Structures are given as C-alpha cells and as structure tokens.
Design a binder for these strands. Structure first.
Lengths: 119, 208
RNA sequence: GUCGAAUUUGGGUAUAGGGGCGAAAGACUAAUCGAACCAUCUAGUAGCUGGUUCCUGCCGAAGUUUCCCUCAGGAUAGCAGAAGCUCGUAUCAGUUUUAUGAGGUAAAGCGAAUGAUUAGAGGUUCCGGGGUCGAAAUGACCUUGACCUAUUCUCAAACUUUAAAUAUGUAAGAAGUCCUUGUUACUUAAUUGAACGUGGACAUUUGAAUGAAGAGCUUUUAGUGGGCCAUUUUUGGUAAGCAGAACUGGCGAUGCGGGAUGAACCGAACGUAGAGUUAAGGUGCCGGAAUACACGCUCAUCAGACACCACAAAAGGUGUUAG
RNA sequence: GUGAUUUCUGCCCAGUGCUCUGAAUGUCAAAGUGAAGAAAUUCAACCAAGCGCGGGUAAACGGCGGGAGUAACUAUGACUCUCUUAAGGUAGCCAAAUGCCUCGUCAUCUAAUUAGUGACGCGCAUGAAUGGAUUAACGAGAUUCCCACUGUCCCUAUCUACUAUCUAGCGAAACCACAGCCAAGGGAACGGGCUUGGCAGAAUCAGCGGGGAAAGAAGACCCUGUUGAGCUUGACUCUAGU
RNA sequence: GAGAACAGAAAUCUCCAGUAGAACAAAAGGGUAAAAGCCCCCUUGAUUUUGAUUUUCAGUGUGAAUACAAACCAUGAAAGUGUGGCCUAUCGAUCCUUUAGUCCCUCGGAAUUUGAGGCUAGAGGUGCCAGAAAAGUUACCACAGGGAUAACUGGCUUGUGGCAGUCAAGCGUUCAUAGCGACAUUGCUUUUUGAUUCUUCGAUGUCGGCUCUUCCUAUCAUACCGAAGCAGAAUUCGGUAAGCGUUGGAUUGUUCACCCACUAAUAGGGAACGUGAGCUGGGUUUAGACCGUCGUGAGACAGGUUAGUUUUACCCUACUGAU
RNA sequence: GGUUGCGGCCAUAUCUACCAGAAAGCACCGUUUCCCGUCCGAUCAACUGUAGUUAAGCUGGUAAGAGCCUGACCGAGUAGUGUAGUGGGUGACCAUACGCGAAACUCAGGUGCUGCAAUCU
C-alpha cells in the first residue's frame, strides 16, 4: 500500500530456517578480486550488505573492492534499454559463483596438449 | 436468510475472518458427534459416511439442519445408543454483505459456511452391523437437505470405524496402537513380561 | 374593471446610459434593458464544436512513463518516418541445451511454530460451585469448571517447517588460459600481493544446440497520451453486456472463409491473374457436397444452440436402456 | 419604517449598528523636537482624529433557553431544586397561507369527506409598527357550502350561416442523406437500409393523427471550462467623498 | 520448588534448576542472546571538505540511504568500531530576507572610510507537499462543449419485491400432506426498488387523467370437472380454460390510499412505466407575491401558499373508406 | 589419547537418563601480601606456589528412545502445474493429450561428527 525501500521484502530479505543469526566467520574470511564474478544474496544480519531489493538474486562482477569490508560492486543492467547501474554492496552479503567451468578450461587446454602428444 | 446466493463458489480467497475480521457473526453448528459418544471403539463398528462431490460452500445454518434431521431419525428409530454422527465438515469462511451512495464497499461479515471439496467427507457417522439400513436410510434425509451433495457411502479404514482395516483390527486382535518402536513396553502386551522381551530386544540391537 | 377624478388625452417643453426615469415588476427607456443604440479597439480570446481540395508507392503507430491548479490541455519518455554514417561473420537472438544461482505460491501441514477450532480419555494435579464420615484452619474422598499429559476432530490473504510448475538471473567456445619477468602512490616484514606492461607455447579451437537478409552507430521530426475485446489468474460486488489488476493474442488501424445474423469467436492476412489442394465450416431442400455406410438410444409438445440476453435448477417416473 | 378606524407596544443594550459633555490613564501618521555618527542615515520622546474604556439606544438589526425532583386510584403542576445566556414569548393566536410527524384528535356538514367549519395547544418552527388581535364596508383576490339554473353528465341527437369539398382565375411555406410495408436476429442493447422468414401490381380521392425515436429556437433541468455578467458582506484590492 | 511481617491472588522483597515465549521510542514486518536486549565505564562522528553510489522496470531534481577519499576526533589492550537512533516511514524549488563563511571581488573619472552590491554553506514558506497570494449568490441570468457526466425510455443483473418448489419437525384435539407447513434448500419472475452508465443534451418535453384498441395469465366472475376435516346449503383446494365480463360517487393533482353503494365479479399485468404531430393543465419544474425556517446580505429550502402563452400535418407509410 | 586458537554444517547440530575414565593434559580445587573487583558479599573478577580430589566438568559408551537426519521403496507418477482441443457436464466442475513434477505419511542405516594448524604423555 506504501512504497518504502524494503517494501514487499518480508520474505525475500528473509532469514535462515535455523541458521537464524551470526555470520559464518568463513563467509567473512575469503578474498575478493577486482575481477571475479560475485552473486548478490542479502542477509539481514548485516546492513549495507543489504542490496536494495531489485539487485536481489542478481549475479554480476566486482568493480571496486574497497576491501575494507566494503564489498565490491559489479552492476548488471535493467529493462527498456539495459543501462548498467553499479551498486556498492558489502563483504558479508555477496557470494562466489559457477564460473566453475575454468575447471574445464583447464581440462580442455591441458587434455588438449596431452592430445597434441597423443595425436 | 438472504437465500443461498452468497453461496457456493470462491469470488474471494478465504476470509477466515479471525484476528483480522473481528465481528464474525457467531457460528450455527456448535455440535459435532451428537450421538452415542464416549463409545466403545469396538462395538458400534462398520461406519457408513456421507461424502460430498462438489467444491461448494455447504452453508452454516445448513450444516445445522443437517444435524437436526440427522439426529431426529438417528435416534427416533434406533436410540441414544445407536448414533454418533461425527459432524466432519465444519464452518470457517465468514462471508459478507454490502451497503457516498455506491462508492467502494467491502463486506461486513454475514454468516460462516464451509468448503466441501469435491470428494470430501461430510456429517459422517458410524454404528454396528445390525444398524445398517437404519443409518443408511437416515443419512438419505440429509442429502435431501443441504445444497446436495451425497455419497451415502459404505466404508472401512484405518479405524475411524469398524473399519476395514477389517482384516486389520480383526488382526490386531492382539494389541492396540504402538507397537511403534521396541523398548519401554508399558502397554501390557503379554506375557511374562519385560524380562523375556528385553532379552530378545537387545539380542538384536547387539546384532549391529 | 372603472367610468367625474390619484380622471383621459393633443401639442409644447425637462431628465440619456451604471445614466435616466419606476404607486417597484428588474419595470420602462423607439418590437431593444438584471445596464439601450452606433461606430471603433477588433480578424478581441478560445485547453471546446465544425471543415480542412489531386493520384498512385513504400514504412507504419499511441491511450501507456514521469511533472505540472492536467483532469477534454501540455510537457517527458516509449512507439514510429526520413536521412544517412562506419565496416563485413566481429558477432547478433522475446530460442532450447549443460553447469550454477535466485523464488515462497500451487500444493502440502497442524498426534511441528503461531492462531484458530471438535471430542471424550489419564492426572496418583491445583484454585471452587455441588455432597458425603460431613460442618467451622476437619483430615478424606467426592461431582462441573480450572492447567498439564499421551490422544481426536477439522482450518488460515494479511500463519509454517517442507516446498513445486511457469517464469527469472547469470556462465558457455573460449581473444582464453599457461609460462617469463618489469613498472610505484597503494598495504603486507618482504622473494606481499596487488593492478597494470614486455618476451614466450597453442586458437580455429574434441556438446553446446538452432537460427541470421551483417552489424554497429548518429542525428533529427510526426502523429499518440479517451482505449476496447476475449482465453487462463485473479480484487471488489447477491450479481452485470458492472468496476478493477496480470501475462499472452487480439479489435481499434482488417478486408478474406466459417459462426444465418454481428469490432474482438474460429480458419485464416489482401499487388493483378490461370490452374490445383485445402482451414474452419457443411453435404434431404433452399444451396456447392452421400436421402452416404455402422452399432445402439430416444415417441403429445423430446429434441437439432463450440464464445452470446445465447439460459433452466433442486426434487421426482413401474417410460423405456444397460449396470 | 408600518399601513383605515378599533383596540393593543410585553422582556431583553451582551452581540451588530447607531449615538454624548464623558475615561485619572494605553496605541496612534505626516510634518515639528531630542539624542548619535562624518552623513547618509537610525534610535528617541512627546502626538489630531480614530481605536480601545465609559454611558444612552430596540415604532434600530434583531433576539424571547433549556432537566430534575415534586400523591392523597390514576395521570398530573400554580411547587421548589437546579445548570445556565441580555432577556428565557407577555398579552393575545392557530393544524391558519407558518404545524414537521399529519390524512393531527373531537365534534360538525355527507349515504361517504387527504375538502370545508367549529373547537383543543410543551405550537417541527405563531406573537406584538419585523407590527399583535380584532373589524363594518369594499373585492374580475384565494377557498367550502346551499338555492335556483342548467347538455357539465347519464346519452347522445337535430337545426341553421361559413369552411372544408368540386370547377375558373390567382398560388405560396415548412420540411427535405437516399428512401418509404411487415415479423423476429444481431446490431452503438426500440432497423426502412442488414440476416432469415411474411409477403409483394399501374395509376389515384377524402379523411386521419400509430409511426417519420417527424418538424423551429446549436435544450429551462446536470456537469466540464483555468467562460462570463447582476446583485452581496465582518474576501481580497483600491476610490470618489468625507 | 523454596523464606514471608503492612503482601495476603500479587502489587515488592531476597535462593535456587530447563522452549528465545522478552526487549529493542514509537505502525508492521525484518532482523538481533557473551547480542542489536540490561548494568556499569569513558566520549560528542548528530563532526569538515568533497565526489561517486543506491533508490520510478529510471534516462528528470528531491528525501532518504551505501562504499570510498582526504582531514579531525571519540572509544578499546587491542584488532576494531563509530560517518546519527538496528533496516524499511518521519519531510521542500524559484526571487526575497537573515546568518556563517575569506576579510576575497566592484561601485567604471582617483581615493578614503559609511553604505551598497557579489562568491560559497545554512535558517526563514510553500501539506495542491514539481512550489498561484484569493468570499458568496443568481429563481433574472449568459456562453462554448460534454452522452466523456447525472435525472427519463431501453438495456443488462435481480440483491431487494413478488411468485411458485423440494425434505417433513411441526400445526390441524385422533392423524405429518384433507387444509396448511419450522428449519434448511432449488428456482421463476421484470408493472417495485437497487445497482450499472451502453443508446440518446451536435432535441427525448414531465405526473394524472380523459379517450381507444390489443395482447399476457400468476383466473375475481361465468363453462365442465377432481379432493375436502365433502350430509344440505355455505364455503375451501385443484385441473381444462384467456371465449367473455370485470361498474358509479365522496376526500385529494394525485398514482396510491380510504370509505359510501352496486353486482355474477366488482382479478392482476404488459404495449417508450401505450396512449399533447389526441385534449386537459390540476400537480411537478421560470419570472410576480405571502409566510414560516437558515442566513449579517444577496438569497436558500424536494417546507406550506396563490397568479402564471401546450405552435405546425398538404408530403410517405399505416389505416376507414373512395374512383 | 588430550590441550590450545579453529572451519564447518552450525537439529543432516541436543537433549535425557545411566554407566565407565591408564598415561599424560584442563579441570575442580589451597591462598589474600600486593594490581585489581563486589548495588552487598575474594562467589565472579583477578592477584600468588602445592595441602586433596576424579566427584563433577569434560571424553567416550550404553539406550533406539526425543531430537534432523540420509537414502530408498509403497506413499507417488498423486497433489499442483506448462501448453491443446469446435473435448465431456445445467452448472460445479471434470477427462483426455503431450511435458514438468512435490509435500505430509513409513521402511530402513545413521546419532550429532567430521575434519585445520601448534602442541604435547
């Protein structure tokens, strides 16, 4: 009925199930990378590392790393045109990804030279 | 009342009108079992039940009339020892009415009915073999009442009744409920007791 | 009605415009009056009505976004048209496929949270209304409530573990890895990394598929902003040919064949022609097409309606038909 | 201002107006005065009216309350209690041209009365020159009766002139997409025009009032418009005048 | 479960042994347990300068909020943390005025001060919150447009009205159904009324009567029949039945309503709520004029009262007749 | 085997009730002179070197038992849903076509337990 900045969020910005408090001090270790692709995922414990709604679920790529807890950024883009907007999120809210085919970049290249000598 | 026009459909999700709709014009059927209660759970077996096949709102008062004429015969030719007519619908959803001379109006509660899912069991009762047609003919009554409806179906179980489970309970001759695990046997199953069992008992837990 | 008196009436004279005159009506003031007449300002103004002139050919819409004393206007995006650049498999997609994320609604669930509600059981249980040896700190049992305890019954837009389908983010082979070192403001104690860059190995690449009338790019300037249909999903409302949302088509902008009949139904998209098959629909007769071929069912109004004002229930039949 | 006479002028000056020498004192403009700077200029004090304070004023505008108790069956109020604003409707007067419910209740006039008239009163909401109540006569004033009279009517009918009508001469206007027969269907939900069906013969006369959602005066009622204009105050904004 | 003296259900006091049921100003939801709650300790970051970000699918400024940079502090032993109240609400352009800022810029013939003007950062108001400075009345009135927008017809729909129907607990003294039927439930009806805004203000003239056909049947009378708690009579219920009838006067503009009478009966109901190109004009709904009642006034009353212009038919069709 | 700082999932993560415990390690425990601390109170806090203990804590085992598992089979190819019809039925609803495709329920094997660095008998 009103349009405040967390509106509708009641279940999106949800929490847990039983993991209902306190950052996994792992989810806190780990190092960014002025290039590595991050995947937003808000968590009410924090609160800059709350990503203002829309950018929920959306995966992008670290463009800033103010690594002093200040997570990175990335952007993404949105509807009509895609005008890519950038958002400075915080270290406790973002997460890695499935660029995990570089595992198959490797698999490829390597197995492919072992294919050179093989052929 | 206002007829059955605010009758069977949807047109409104489900205003169970509790905490949020305070003024629910109190129910209509504050009965439910009206019959040979405190029963044997043996004894009055083989239950015949009344299933409704038609996603409707079997109204409030309506369920009442059900009860009324239900018991009426139930007893009137079989006795206070004969019935036990488990209500088994039950009436949420507070419907409403209407009444700046036409500009935006929500309903004020106006009687509580209930959603007979097409296949659901309604005002369904249970009794001993020698009551068959007794019960049966009777439930007919209702079907003729109450925005029908109608299974007048003969049953089994589980064990809300006899109830087939026939071969079952007729098999759990020996016992009643758990069963369950195997440990603190405080359901006098017979016969020694503890000692023997608690032998065999871990005698297998040990086999692991 | 009045009819010698506040009489009737000619002539002459006086009062002229927000000014006259008026036993008051907003009357009369040259058929003109809740402000005369003439000319001029003056083609007054116009978010509203009306019309808006010759051919064919191409492209082709809006009713929706935001801000306005905007509610019939306007700005502002968005749709179009024109004009053209820059260069030729770069890479592009209202599309699936693999890998990886995001969802809490359908469902499901209350001998799970919460909040509702059935019903009796067991308390070797406590505060009271009924009784008892009973009767004034009567120990002791007692009947209804009062909270457990293992059970029972059924529910939720604004409840819940669990949790779909549809849709929704990314990624893809690959400019990519792999190797060598070099730059200083960065912080590490630095052979610490960071970011950047040199020299060096292999790309046409051994799951992604499928499609390309390239692709990218710049200006500009029309109309539009009153929208309406359907199927599913829904909000209100007894309801509506009612009022309101949500995808997708559609009508408005469109003819063509079906539906007799008709914006939104079905088929089907229009340069001009010949031939051939068909869609949907139909084939006694109007009317092209069989009074075809089969197995049954129905007999005072029995009927012959995919969407529609297109209607018809509960109840009941020794009619007849199978179960 | 009110309206013959006749009678009759209740009580309210707080409100708004008006109006008096009045108030021991507070605002209150321009010039004029003082103070300070180097002046420009900015602070001062006093200062006409006016204001505000005081009084009169209602045949000036206008006003005229409300609830509790409250014996000698019963209901009852001249009783007192009260809270209260100037004052708390006085004579008088009514279902009246004011009365809501109301077709008020009782009479009265009817065979019969939402009419009349006579009554009765916590009268929605009557009332004293806003004039109160009466009232001879006057009335093309409104109502209801009675008598007479009567085609008003029951129930219509016949007669006269003139006109229709038919001829000669004379000869227009309105209006007008094109037209003009029905029944259902659908349709911008009352087709003449479309679909199906009824049907369906030249050419004309007199009448008529169903239809032409017929005709004239860009509909008396409603709304929209950044459209007016006449009146109007304690709306702005000013002005003759004073 | 322990210890009670104003306490003793407890208001409040101290001991002990386990569901996050509490608490976080304020709404609701999120969140939060060595805390984000509570008790203590120490401070003023609610700080300066910017800029970038995020928040309409967002290209518009605003408010709010996020991460940085540079300073300057707090606090801890530290690593940290702190840029306002845990997050999601709690605010404001444009001239003007005031102030805080260097003591910086100019008054244009030069100076000096006084004053004026500027620059950057704020307060002072815009709530219609994208930001005009604004009383009524018109019944005497007026204009341009609105079926985009209401009275009336029609239209859906039928709640509400009306009308039938199933079940059979009941009445009906004996019996459920002769005659009726609670509860509950299915429906028809479009002369109520209510919704709705499609048609018609870029012409539709209201209510009632008067007249005059014509249709419906949910039949009041008349025709024939069936049941009755039907002896006769007198009634009731029902079927075939719309052929045929269904009246006259007070009172009101009345529809209606209410009487007085009559008679076989004195039924209901459609046709634009039939029927002004067919009266009448009483009501309703102009200007005139009373009153009451609201208003200072102008006026205003869906209050009462009285006086107030109903134009046109030759044409087409339809008919009654006529060549 | 413990002990230190740990990651983890942090009910796929504890309860609850009994036991049992060599070696070491921690614990309990001794003690107030200082630093320091009591809304009172050396409990806590901290502050100093061995009189006595495994009794707790801890650790592991028992229940099978309460918790969540983790898997699979009926449950289940359902419930629900993507598309389609000139399909069915007064209606409500429903069926069939291809496609996705659960949850509760129960049957089982787990039990909280892996594992990091440094130590240590």
């Amino acid at each position: 009925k009103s349009h405040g900045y967390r509106s509708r969020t009641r279940y999106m910005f949800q929490r847990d199930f039983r993991k209902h408090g306190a950052v996994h001090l792992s989810t806190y270790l780990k190092v960014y990378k002025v290039g590595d692709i991050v995947d937003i995922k808000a968590n009410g414990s924090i609160q800059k590392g709350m990503p203002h709604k829309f950018y929920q679920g959306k995966t992008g790529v670290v463009y800033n790393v103010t690594k002093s807890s200040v997570g990175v950024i990335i952007n993404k883009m949105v509807g009509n045109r895609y005008l890519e907007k950038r958002l400075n999120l915080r270290v406790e809210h973002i997460k890695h990804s499935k660029c995990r085919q570089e595992f198959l970049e490797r698999v490829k290249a390597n197995a492919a030279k072992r294919a050179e000598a093989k052929a | 009342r206002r007829p059955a026009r605010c009758y069977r459909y949807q047109k409104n999700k489900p205003y169970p009108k509790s905490r949020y709709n305070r003024a629910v014009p109190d129910s209509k059927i504050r009965i439910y079992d009206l019959g040979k209660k405190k029963a044997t759970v043996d004894e009055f077996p083989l239950c015949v039940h009344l299933v409704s096949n038609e996603l409707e709102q079997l109204s409030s008062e309506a369920l009442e009339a059900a009860r009324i004429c239900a018991n009426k015969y139930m007893t009137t030719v079989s006795g206070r020892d004969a019935f036990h007519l488990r209500v088994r619908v039950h009436p949420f959803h507070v419907l409403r009415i209407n009444k700046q001379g036409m500009r935006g109006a929500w309903g004020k509660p106006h009687g509580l009915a209930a959603r007979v899912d097409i296949g659901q069991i309604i005002f369904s009762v249970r009794t001993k073999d020698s009551n068959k047609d007794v019960v049966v003919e009777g439930l007919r009554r209702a079907r003729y009442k109450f925005p029908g409806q109608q299974k007048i179906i003969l049953s089994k179980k589980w064990g809300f009744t006899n109830l087939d489970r026939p071969e079952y309970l007729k098999k759990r001759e020996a016992g009643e409920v758990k069963d369950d695990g195997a440990f603190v046997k405080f359901l006098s199953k017979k016969g020694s007791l503890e000692n023997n069992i608690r032998e065999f008992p871990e005698y297998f837990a040990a086999q692991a």
